[PDB]
Symmetry: C3
Subunit: 152 residues, 3 copies
Amino acid sequence: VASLRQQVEALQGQVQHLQAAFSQYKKVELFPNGQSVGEKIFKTAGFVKPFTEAQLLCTQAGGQLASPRSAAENAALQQLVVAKNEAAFLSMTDSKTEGKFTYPTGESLVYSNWAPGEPNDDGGSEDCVEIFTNGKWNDRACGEKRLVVCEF
Amino acid sequence: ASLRQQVEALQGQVQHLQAAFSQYKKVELFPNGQSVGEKIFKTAGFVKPFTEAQLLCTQAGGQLASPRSAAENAALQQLVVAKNEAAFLSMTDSKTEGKFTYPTGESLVYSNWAPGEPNDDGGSEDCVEIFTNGKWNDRACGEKRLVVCEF
Amino acid sequence: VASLRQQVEALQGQVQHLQAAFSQYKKVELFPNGQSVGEKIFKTAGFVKPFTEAQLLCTQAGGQLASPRSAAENAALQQLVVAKNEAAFLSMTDSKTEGKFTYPTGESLVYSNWAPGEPNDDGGSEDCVEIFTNGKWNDRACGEKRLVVCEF
Ligand SMILES: OC[C@H]1O[C@H](O)[C@@H](O)[C@@H](O)[C@@H]1O
Ligand SMILES: OC[C@H]1O[C@H](O)[C@@H](O)[C@@H](O)[C@@H]1O
Ligand SMILES: OC[C@H]1O[C@H](O)[C@@H](O)[C@@H](O)[C@@H]1O
Ligand SMILES: [Ca+2]
Ligand SMILES: [Ca+2]
Ligand SMILES: [Ca+2]
Ligand SMILES: [Ca+2]
Ligand SMILES: [Ca+2]
Ligand SMILES: [Ca+2]
Ligand SMILES: [Ca+2]
Ligand SMILES: [Ca+2]
Ligand SMILES: [Ca+2]
Ligand SMILES: [Ca+2]
């Protein structure tokens, strides 16, 4: 009772100090290659890779390629693209059904920010998606190399 | 009694978090960070002009490196030495020439000026850079220097 | 009692939040320069340095140069070497007694993965160890510059 109470007050002090230390370290971690938005975190590897290799890096790391599902998420991702000045690959593709872009899960897009005229499947072989420094999207060949950005 | 059990369970979970966190703090700081007291300095690894550098730090939830003691200055110096690139500090005398202040407007509580500095060379040096030897020199804000933020 | 009960529930909520937030943060931290194996974490600095310099960097960081003690640890370390496509230095040397490799403490090796014919003290001057992209080890001159990888 009395012992338990003070034991609770003591443990909470420890937990709140931990919350403070963690919050500080989270900010430190995100600088300068990450961006937090909502409960999602985007982080770039700082280099470019073809889609398949980029996808594998994110999955092996316990996440997946950047999948902006709102204007806010797209804006956060855009910050990293602008910072590295390198267009990045998104996770979505229309490899299964041409013209129908989906997330790795197979779910259809719930948000899109296609540049005017896109997606055009240029050359009849653009099944991956890249995001430019202006935040707009363009379908591009999966074999091209683009900035690797994962979401966790 | 049920609460007693819950408390003992929480103690074990907290001990685990503390141990795991302790390890990750060391991992995080390697190789671009420095912890001194309750402050953490971290470099972006590249150079930028003052305004750009300042914005990067502020948007990241911190501010440009602002050593307030010899200890903090020495810690910051370690990053500068490691990257072999002089860095910008947060302080400027842009408001009133000759009076350097922190982004808040507060006057300096510590400084490590090289002899003869600040000298407002060319009548246009309102920013501050820190050398690999830890000394400070006022320099043009337009120059590009290592970006180091504090959190 | 009743109050203590409400506070314990609040504390429980705080700890659960931290467990979830910390787990996410760990994945973010490790991407793309770290590898977790068991209770050990390997992290590369992303650049090369001669042995002495690399060794000092790790020690000052509160850790030490990569010291794989099992096939599992060696495989984890190998992932970073492959990722950076740069051979890395291990912590072990035979500087004290030629022909006898030891950890920084002085203890004899508990595991090794030498390439065929190694260690061979080529030129009578190889007292350090490098790990290749294939995971095998080779003794090499300590003055050479190799990928810096520390363990924490
Ligand atoms: O290089 C491919 C690229 O070429 C142009 O920029 C446009 O036609 C794009 O739609 C297309 O993706
Ligand atoms: O250090 C002497 C002098 O050298 C250059 O002119 C600049 O770096 C000045 O800021 C400095 O004051
Ligand atoms: O042929 C093997 C031999 O090649 C070179 O001489 C060096 O890399 C040596 O360390 C290695 O033992
Ligand atoms: Ca980190
Ligand atoms: Ca197609
Ligand atoms: Ca297509
Ligand atoms: Ca296109
Ligand atoms: Ca002035
Ligand atoms: Ca001035
Ligand atoms: Ca000057
Ligand atoms: Ca020898
Ligand atoms: Ca030898
Ligand atoms: Ca050899």
